[PDB]
């Protein structure tokens with residue numbers, strides 16, 4: 001009597017290779033080997049690290065400069081930022097063909113909640129390394145002992161911002177960000193002069209755009225402008241639980257300059273709506289952890305590496321190898337486009353280590369949420385109930401008749417939600433859910449049958465949290481976890497359901 005609502009597929013926007021999101025990026029300062037005349041900015045290496053106080057490839061440049069009688073200096077902006085770092089680590093007494101250092105940015109906890117209201121002003125700093133260019137036609141200067149500590153400016157080795165004297169140069173960054181229009185503007189300035197202007201569109205908790213140069217004229221000699229070329233590849237992200245901070249980068253179009261930046265807003269009374277759900281329930285501790293997500297629920301991020309969850313069938317298995325070590329995940333479903341839920345474990349031996357459930361979803365815009373209507377949501381769920389050492393496991397399927405089903409009555413009018421979570425070939429539901437709808441989410445309680453559920457296990461009022469996903473809120477997802485005695489009985493469960501149309 002019910003079938004899935006005809007929905008338009010999620011529009012796939014192909015990025016370009018320099019616009020792939022990550023926790024951070026790092027670039028080795030260009031040093032022209034011999035007898036190369038021009039060494040361009042190489043490809044930015046992605047950072048998969050969640051340690052802020054760790055500078056990328058620090059031990060390498062350290063090991064290079066010191067036996068060569070050099071001294072390291074690092075600007076990471078750790079003195080002012082909480083969730084982000086940006087800047088450099090370079091060799092002050094660099095000469096010759098040995099490595100000079102790195103220019104980078106990184107951040108932790110990409111935002112799942114964005115501010116709501118007026119545009120925000122983020123303030124911070126930016127840094128940069130230039131390409132290396134020996135050619136005399138280029139006309140890069142020699143001996144500007146008033147501006148830089150360095151004799152040959154960007155010739156054998158790139159010009160880093162740390163080579164400049166503070167007496168004459170301060171590189172500041174300022175951005176104005178509207179999360180409503182999902183738009184961003186800003187300026188990268190030296191002292192009071194505007195070097196770059198930046199434009200960007202916000203998608204998820206990332207932003208992609210361009211940096212236009214204020215001074216297009218390259219010039220020559222002591223009047224050489226290292227910031228004449230634009231960049232159509234500015235990419236960054238918001239960090240902090242509520243987009244408290246932001247960091248990013250851009251590479252010049254002719255790869256003559258690579259610039260990084262970090263900034264933070266000071267705003268007083270910031271209201272936040274949620275945009276991203278990404279959670280992981282551990283099926284042993286029954287504790288819950290946040291997953292790193294950038295606004296694509298069909299992509300799971302573990303230890304920094306990327307595993308895509310979408311596939312050709314209803315539920316798809318995907319396997320990836322990370323630092324530790326080989327990870328497997330089963331993801332559902334194929335009819336869900338703005339959310340993904342499933343299982344996630346590590347395949348050590350037959351056995352599984354770190355068994356888990358996960359739920360990701362791209363929240364429905366708070367203004368896109370229906371205010372009137374009464375709908376039906378049919379879907380499925382993954383779960384694990386366990387008293388002592390015997391287990392009951394729910395595994396997502398497409399058997400709408402007699403599988404692990406989830407049925408939901410949703411009234412946007414009264415803002416009420418009810419749900420039934422079934423076992424395979426079960427007439428009466430194992431779990432019943434009663435939740436209240438607020439904004440683009442719902443919070444409520446789950447209870448067993450009034451007589452109990454035997455693997456006997458019985459409990460009432462376990463905290464259930466969920467949300468509506470997609471532009472039309474035609475998809476909903478949720479989760480609940482609980483344990484007693486710490487820990488005798490445990491329950492972990494995640495569910496998903498699609499909006500239905502009759503007949």
Ligand code: NA
Nearest residue numbers: 265266267268
């Ligand atoms: Na503040």
